[model samples]
Target chain A: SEFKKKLFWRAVVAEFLATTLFVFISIGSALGFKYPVGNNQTAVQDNVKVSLAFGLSIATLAQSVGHISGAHLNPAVTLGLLLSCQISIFRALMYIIAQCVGAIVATAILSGITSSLTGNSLGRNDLADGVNSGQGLGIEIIGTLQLVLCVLATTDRRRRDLGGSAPLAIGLSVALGHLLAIDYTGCGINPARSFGSAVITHNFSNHWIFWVGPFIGGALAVLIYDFILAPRS
Target chain B: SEFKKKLFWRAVVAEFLATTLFVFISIGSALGFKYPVGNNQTAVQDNVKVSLAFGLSIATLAQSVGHISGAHLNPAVTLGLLLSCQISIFRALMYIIAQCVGAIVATAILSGITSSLTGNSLGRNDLADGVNSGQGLGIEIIGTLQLVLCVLATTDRRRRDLGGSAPLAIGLSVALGHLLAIDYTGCGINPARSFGSAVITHNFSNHWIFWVGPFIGGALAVLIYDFILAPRS
Candidate 1:
């Protein structure tokens, strides 16, 4: 059933929609919220809480739709799948296009509604105070590598022998990554997710790393999964 | 192995011990943390973050025990298994008894330890600010429904054809319920769980709902699984 061409399209559409939703909620968390969450206190009080919101929302949405899409919500993830030839190049482009478009639309609507609601412009990223460009890029690369590797190990159909808890394990990996990554680079492991918002507001300062880091890191994860853990196919 | 008589006792003890531990760490998040998580804060201070501690902690513990014990720490869940003819009446009774004892022991320990930790003597249930008896009951009912349904659907070995991801799915459901239900009933969809703590501490106010609501709700979920979305026989 999975190899069927028509079923492949369904996977593409589901991935597109899920990734779109993931970007919407996660970036939204980094920006602000649909309703208020909290203010600055401890790390747990402010940023940890917000990072968690982003991670968990992607998780729940993925759990609901992942069977169809494989829930490749990040560009790094899509690339890994493509490199493995799990999905074709043409379908991959469609997924990226859908992802960017979905994210852009969500932000536009959020900006409109929230600007009215709070009388404050939506939360925008500006190199997060004190972190320089070099540090930021390094963080994204490391962060996305750990994340994609977790996904590959936990969710791949072939790993059923390990345990049958892909969504939980993957979600935990995301949350765990943010637990540390939020301290640096604001945890931008998904290039398309970051670009969707970054491109819209025209803030590409030091954006190269966001693209290059995750892909390089993602490829590393694919290597680990293929050579270290996965049996020779 | 599961069909044997000796396995019945192992299952029962596992249910009890697992439920007891479940209550201990779970309630600790709501009660034992430096700041009680259920304490709501405005948008400036996030509430859900603290709530998430409970969900994540449970996922960790459950992951540890799910393979060995089946981790049906809730009596209501065992009841559902009975209705499905998955367990015998005698074994179900033993599991329920073990779970009830486990919950009670968990609460008793909580009271003593919480006394040491925060100098708060009472580890028993108290109403969260505005949530009263009926609201708590509603939360438990809905929360348990989502929880028990997933436990059945994911844990069912037959769902492998749909690409089984049980531990992950079950863990996510726990997190999902916590995301919404913690604000309300502190997310007690387990009757034996609430009863054990309440009885030991002699704090029975509004306790009926936690037990009745989750048990009935879990039973109702069994109906849903049987009829509309029976995962597999």
Candidate 2:
């Protein structure tokens, strides 16, 4: 039994490494480039860029490490799987811890690299202008709901014969959320992503929205998919 | 045999429908938005938007239709599979014809929708300023080469146990190519995408580059993957 635990620990390592790189690359892409000189650039372009960076990084990381840990890079995903009874509570707890720590590390490294380049907000998640905390939370929930649904549906063994890349679907779900809500809430479908940036930046305005919204979304996805759409026989 | 031919024809229909929607949604996202007023916007933002549009659309379409047809959705992809002897010559010819027609139809619809909004270039692929034809061709070749390699590697029945979504990987590979090359060449890893836009716009400047480059890239991917990377027994 102890020997078998070694594999579990290895999976944890994979999750940590994957999330670290995920945050590093995605946030780095967001803050890395300066606006082109003499061009009045709106945030719209940066929104698309950040969305792709977040999505493609997930797809690539999931493809690379899916076999090891199922690539639950988000705590929301881990929570959803837990609610669905797919993973043990111990494993879920461990994954969330790893994800948060990995994200923090990622944000710190990103801050260091971009320190001299620009005064970094570290890609912190916040309600955009005219978006209140309530609307922001609702937006995050809906975004993460679709994402968790895509993840569960694709990875459901009962539906594997449907035959496509769950990782890619999952990643694009993240992208879709960002595309729709980036202008509204800076899009935090994953608590770890928001947490890392907030922790590094030492700014936590409306911080609880990221946590509460995605968790509720992940939980709702479990109810919708497992209890309503396709119940476990 | 005649009855079996019905399934083949259905596949051709799927390819046509898939390519039509693929071009429609992807290019629509690109030209759909007007730059925000009073913000000096650059093409950089649009590139990100278009890149995600193209890649996610491919991923979604492939997931939807990959079972009916292989969802090549691109002449370059079809040509790669043909060189690899993965499809019959007749089927390849049919699929390419369907793809081109689908693309043309998609562009015509897009032009109609956006006509009153802006002077439509219809998102034709062109060499960006400072990129010469030879360099543009090389970039196109490299972009398609990576895409084809991803398609083959993910779908290799031999490596299916390696486990992930082939469609998603293929789509992200498309996104990856756009992110890298969109600035240099409006990123025509798929000839059907370029062809549809060009025919609709009637601007065939450097048109051969899209066809020649992707086909060469696709052929080279077959050589590299089938011969050097993992030889078929």
Best by TM-score: 2
> Model 1 TM-score?
0.54
| Model 2: lDDT of residue B34 | 51
Off by over 4 Å in 1: A1-71, A90-126, A132-138, A141-180, A191-233, B1-13, B25-69, B75-101, B109-233
For model 1, what is the C-alpha lDDT against the true structure? 0.61
Please provide, for model 2 over A140-193, each residue's C-alpha lDDT reduced to its tens digit, 9 standing for 90 to 100. 777789888988888777763765566667888888887878788767778988
Q: For residues B118-227, write the lDDT of model 2, one tens digit per residue.
A: 44567666665434555556445644665776677666666544545567687887786666455456567788788888785799888888888889878987876566
Residue ranges of candidate 2 with Cα displaced over 4 Å: A32-46, A116-119, B1-45, B49-233
Tens-digit lDDT track of model 1 for B68-181: 557676677778778777777787778788778877787777776575444352434444443444555544554456567656655555444333345555565556555544
- Best of the candidates, DockQ: 2
**What value does the TM-score of chain B take for model 2?**
0.92
**How far does residue A185 in candidate 1 sit from its true spot (Å)?**
5.3
